[PDB]
Design a protein around this ligand. Structure first.
Ligand SMILES: [Cl-]
Ligand SMILES: [Zn+2]
Ligand SMILES: [Zn+2]
Ligand SMILES: [Zn+2]
Ligand SMILES: [Zn+2]
Lengths: 49, 396, 396, 396
């Protein structure tokens, strides 16, 4: 709604999350970049001690 | 080989694709492949050996994964990736060099360097991905005993040989009948000379035949056949077969008569071209038979009739020629050609580090000696080193 | 054609990428494309062959999809994919061989084999994906009425022709002025000879011209022009124009004078090179005009002055020459060249299965006859079979 | 350059992959890259210049994004994409043409046309993605001062030169000792001629030397070395060095003796070949030193003894020749070659639009003049225009 985009018609069971589709669809750089960060924010598995 | 090739391919993809500003979706799959390579290589120690003058080098892999956080790659990302890629390219180039300078008589297709032997372990199979190069494709097909194919522009299939045969000769070398030929690379130039111009030939016809056996079967071959042999059409002073004296050749070029080019496989006739010149196709052959004739002109103008007397002395020696250039062909075995740089790369690496002569290749990587004695062991070792040279040339 | 190429490209990608150990993310899109191919081909019967000695072969497609989930490809996955790929590759090879052996005067661009005509149906359009090769890309660009371009290293643009013209001659053939030329492939050697050495020519200059009309326009052409013609610079007993007698040629080579190479399009001068030798660029032309003059040396040394008397007999004949080699060019139409094997592949397939001579091509696909009469119907059929041969080469 | 190349690569991918019926998953990444390009280019005005006869053109970008919802591409999608692609490809071709016809003395590597300078701005850096072509790969490596590699089949490294040197000469030009040479594109044909056949030479041997200084270093070079020079083996009438008179050459060919080929880098010997003919490898060199000897044959048959008297007059002049042909090589600098079309394309564009001579290149883009004085500024400008021409040939 902020960018005037048609409401996302999201299917239950989609391989992609809504944020991944939106990242592919959002032309604003700051929003798309935050979306990409969320889509790829993961724990790093590290052996410590 | 497939693993080493996959490493080099991943590094080349990373060099070409991890660039400032690029969408992460352009590189996502590449980043996953690269991180898989990092995971597989981490914790493994490699040594690239000290044969010849190649320095002994040790390789340790303790790299962090490439990030996945940016929507567009920035300069910091490119620099971190560049550092990791530079180390990996150094390693792959050193492994390729260490493999190229080694050879084996027993199993020359198998890896010879210790690092390529370690990379053949199952643990590294995760690295393996798209094998789209012609040489790696042929390597995999050969491993499965499938019909391999190497396409060559001007294949260097003929060992260098500039020789002559005298079917008629005498110690003064003034009534000579025979042939002289240059076989070099992809070219054959043959010339039949009769000093008496077939004055006493059974029908005023002097037959010449040249048989060239190819060390490997060639297929789908484009061949230019031209009447004259410009190399054997000027005055020459030629050593005698024993080198004791020198004889004189004063060619005059006549049109070859009844030109018959046969391309033979297993002694059976596959392709026949009679009186055809220009581009011809030999689909599958391993021997070339060129049969031509010096036919005495039934009619001569006074100058022509003066060139060729009825008896000795003979000053103008009637020569017919043939030129045969293999422009393109396909061979199941690796060969040097006019376009690819595999042989030059292997030779350059062997000379740069003064690799001692081994039990497989001639003692300069000299191609005439190699192709003359193209044994199965030599073919195996050459396919290995040429595949490794192509893998190296992907990065270096 | 696009569908057959898509089948072949899918199979080639599957061969190169569906390999043991590789990440599934390396092949996901490829797996989807392969599955789409399977879905589209399922339930369809195809027949190939039945012409010449090409055997009749029936093809039925009932294959399952690849739905297995994995992080990395294992041996089971590869073996299943390999079975499907082998069947599909055999089918595509047979369809390509079936199309390569066929021709039609009308609509020679259109598919000729029944399998390819069936594959042109709308239901198979789903198979279509990346069309990146030069030949298929040109095919699509042409279908769009867009300007296409085939790049050729040494285009086989000149039909073989070793001829001569005598401008001054007599039955004795001892005072001859004229030209002799070899036009073969991408090479043109020409030589103007005057037996009198232009003793009585106006201004002591003899002008020679040679016009070679290319059957197709060439663009972006790199040409090497060399002053001399080594093919017409040695003594030669040449046949009479009617073949009744033979004449004698005893060249002594003078440097050509006022050399002018004109590259023409529709009779207009596009490129002109005057006294320029080495590498030149002809940007767009359908004709080559070589004009060169034999200029009698105004000042001679006694050895030179003795070779050119005032009157007959003339023993040393003054010959000027030129060599013109097209190293690389671009043609809108398909041509044989030195590096590619499409012509050789088509000829090999036609010869191996004993394809009877048809109404479009010359017997044996002889390139000289084909390019001498390179008609629009012949051009359409040739582009069809060359695109099919390039598609076949990807797999065979 | 990276941005222009990325635009061209995106357009080529779109032309090859956005096809009717194809799975959207085949193009998803490409569609993302294409849409990012559209977003970056939308709203920007470009002008392609009016230098020469090249027309001023204005480019305005306001294009819709390509859709994403389809599962298989249909006709509507393909037509929308094709319209956008055609406009973009026209723009890229015009930008490449504008850059190709421009040169600068100081920053010849830097962009010269207005459109390419505008594309160098940061706002367009997001367009940049996979840089996999050899020319753009070398461009990126050159920007980073990294070792560059251009592979050339038959590099055009030697400027055209048909010259002779005489070491023994008289005004009558009858007892001459000297050398003749043609340095063509990749060819060195040299021949030493002694008219007395080394009758009075110490030890009956005449030494000949020929040094060719390459203007750029070559590496991994494949060289065919043949023991005769067919260009200097037929009678000639040759101008004197001043052109005041002509002299006569009547060669008879003897086997070259003590044939030594030295490949040198900065004066140090890198490779040495004695009595080797056929394929040889010169791994790194900028200088070729061909030394050979005419040895008077100690034993002569009566004809050979007749050819060579003990004193003047000398009618049969003993010539010994070598031929050197670089089939493949690697250079750190862009060069013309027999296989690529970059020089031909740049020259064609400059000629078609009547680009006046600039302060960098020789008039007409003549390769001999350019390579004779291949200065660093000329190298920078030439690499720029060659990279632009390669980018252009992806689409045009
Ligand atoms: Cl060539
Ligand atoms: Zn003898
Ligand atoms: Zn006549
Ligand atoms: Zn070539
Ligand atoms: Zn002189």
């Amino acid at each position: 709604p902020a960018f005037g985009m048609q409401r996302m018609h999201y299917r239950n069971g989609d391989p992609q999350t809504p944020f991944q589709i939106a990242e592919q669809q959002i032309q604003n750089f700051q929003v798309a970049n935050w979306l990409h960060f969320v889509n790829n924010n993961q724990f790093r598995q590290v052996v410590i001690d | 080989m497939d693993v080493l090739y996959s490493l080099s391919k991943t590094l080349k993809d990373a060099r070409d694709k991890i660039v400032e500003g690029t969408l992460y979706s352009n590189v996502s799959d590449l980043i996953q492949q690269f991180n898989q390579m990092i995971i597989t290589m981490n914790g493994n120690e490699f040594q690239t050996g000290g044969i010849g003058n190649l320095p002994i080098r040790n390789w340790n892999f303790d790299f962090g994964l490439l990030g996945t956080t940016l929507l567009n790659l920035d300069a910091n990302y490119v620099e971190t990736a560049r550092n990791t890629i530079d180390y990996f390219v150094d390693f792959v180039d050193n492994v390729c060099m260490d493999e190229m300078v080694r050879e084996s008589q027993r199993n020359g297709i198998a890896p010879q360097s210790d690092s390529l032997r370690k990379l053949s372990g199952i643990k590294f199979k995760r690295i393996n991905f798209d094998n789209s190069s012609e040489y790696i494709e042929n390597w995999n097909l050969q491993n499965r005993r499938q019909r391999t194919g190497f396409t060559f522009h001007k294949p260097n299939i003929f060992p260098y040989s500039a020789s002559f045969t005298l079917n008629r000769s005498q110690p003064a070398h003034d009534n000579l009948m025979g042939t002289m030929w240059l076989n070099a690379g992809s070219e054959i130039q043959v010339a039949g000379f009769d000093y008496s111009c077939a004055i006493n030939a059974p029908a005023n016809i002097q037959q010449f035949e040249h048989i060239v056996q190819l060390r490997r079967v060639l297929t789908t071959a484009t061949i230019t056949l031209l009447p004259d042999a410009e190399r054997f059409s000027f005055p020459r002073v030629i050593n005698s077969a024993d080198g004791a004296t020198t004889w004189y050749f004063n060619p005059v070029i006549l049109r070859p008569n009844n030109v018959e080019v046969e391309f033979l496989l297993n002694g059976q006739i596959i392709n026949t071209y009679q009186a055809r010149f220009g581009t011809i196709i030999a689909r599958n052959f391993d021997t070339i038979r060129l049969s031509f004739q010096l036919m005495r002109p039934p009619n001569m103008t006074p100058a022509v009739a003066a060139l060729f007397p009825n008896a000795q002395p003979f000053e103008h020696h009637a020569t017919v020629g043939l030129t045969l250039r293999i422009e393109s062909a396909v061979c199941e075995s690796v060969l040097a050609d006019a376009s690819k740089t595999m042989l030059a790369n292997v030779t350059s690496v062997r000379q740069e580090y003064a690799i001692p002569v081994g039990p497989v290749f001639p003692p300069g990587m000299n191609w005439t000696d190699l192709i003359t004695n193209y044994s199965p062991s030599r073919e195996d070792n050459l396919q290995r080193v040429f595949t490794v040279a192509s893998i190296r040339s992907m990065l270096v």
